[PDB]
């Protein structure tokens, strides 16, 4: 019954690559753009 | 360090009750004051008030004993605790002493007892049992 | 606790150590 926090890695796609490491971002699912690539970057929620 | 203020409050109450103390003092917080209000309204304690301490405010609780020096509280258990927390739907609310006790439940409408929550059709976190 | 359990354990340990001592060179040559 305890609440467990779990982590998962997904691969997203951004054309111009404006997202650095540590930025909180938003994603939306999409059709497979490659192997293992199934997400699309919406926009950078906050930079860090 | 101090992890559960609510459990500490309950244990202060239990320890004072077992030693037949007429008074117990603890640091003040809104949650402690609210469960004190529920306890007083349900007749488990005599009365409570809040003074001011050296740093913040204190909570002062009067314990109720009968004419023959019999305790008015038979038990105090903490159900939902840090780590393993307990939530109950409006339909599976717990019963204490087969209804003879009171279960304090933290709903979005405030602090209610099991009977009040069942009547109002709400759920929440089962803070404690009193009987 | 009774010392009987310690006695059983110590006899097992002593016998094993004796066995290890008796076959040191044999173990070295086979390993």
């Amino acid at each position: 019954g305890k609440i467990i926090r779990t982590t998962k890695k997904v691969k997203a796609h951004d054309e111009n690559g404006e997202a650095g490491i540590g930025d909180r971002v938003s994603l939306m699912e999409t059709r497979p753009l490659s192997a293992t690539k199934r997400w699309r970057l919406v926009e950078i929620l906050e930079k860090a | 360090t101090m992890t559960d203020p609510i459990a500490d409050f309950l244990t202060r109450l239990r320890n004072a009750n077992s030693a037949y103390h007429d008074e117990v003092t603890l640091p003040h917080s809104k949650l402690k004051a609210n469960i004190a209000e529920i306890l007083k309204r349900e007749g488990y304690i005599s009365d409570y008030r809040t003074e001011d301490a050296r740093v913040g405010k204190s909570l002062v609780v009067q314990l109720k004993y009968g004419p023959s020096r019999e305790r008015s509280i038979a038990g105090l258990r903490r159900v939902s605790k840090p780590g393993l927390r307990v939530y109950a739907k409006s339909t599976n609310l717990p019963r204490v002493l087969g209804g003879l006790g009171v279960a304090i439940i933290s709903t979005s409408s405030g602090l209610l007892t099991d009977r009040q929550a069942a009547r109002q059709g709400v759920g929440g976190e089962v803070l404690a049992y009193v009987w | 606790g009774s010392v009987i359990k310690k006695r059983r354990k110590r006899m097992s340990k002593k016998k094993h150590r004796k066995l290890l001592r008796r076959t040191r060179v044999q173990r070295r040559k086979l390993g």
């Binding site: 305890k2 467990i4 | 780590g83 393993l84 | -």
Partner: protein, 122 residues
């Protein structure tokens, strides 16, 4: 333990010891009598227990106990063996079924006949 210790390691049940491993999941097995002899029980008791050495169809060599009063088993005799422990004998976990295959139902039995393969008197 702590709830976190439980979610990290969990609870592991005790393992179950397999009984009568020679049967291999069957109620009975068919075997051939490797040798038929007699042996003595543990110290508190005393008798000449009749025990046969059986080679089962699961390719396991097993020693089995022959119940009843008299038996007619000898070498190369097809027997049907079942599970059952005999407290006196140290490592005997099987019994020979009377009245099945070569082993015969005992003689002059009138009570608990079905447990010794003795037909009802006509």
């Amino acid at each position: 333990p702590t709830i976190q210790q439980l979610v990290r390691k969990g609870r592991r049940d005790k393992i179950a010891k397999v009984k009568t491993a020679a049967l291999k999941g069957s109620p009975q097995r068919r075997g051939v009598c490797t040798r038929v002899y007699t042996t003595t029980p543990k110290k508190p008791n005393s008798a000449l227990r009749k025990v046969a050495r059986v080679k089962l169809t699961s390719q396991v060599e097993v020693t089995a106990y022959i119940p009843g009063e008299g038996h007619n088993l000898q070498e190369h005799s097809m027997v049907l063996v079942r599970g059952g422990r005999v407290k006196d004998l140290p490592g005997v976990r099987y019994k020979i079924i009377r009245g099945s295959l070569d082993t015969q139902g005992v003689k002059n039995r009138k009570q608990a006949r079905s447990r010794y393969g003795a037909k009802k008197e006509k």
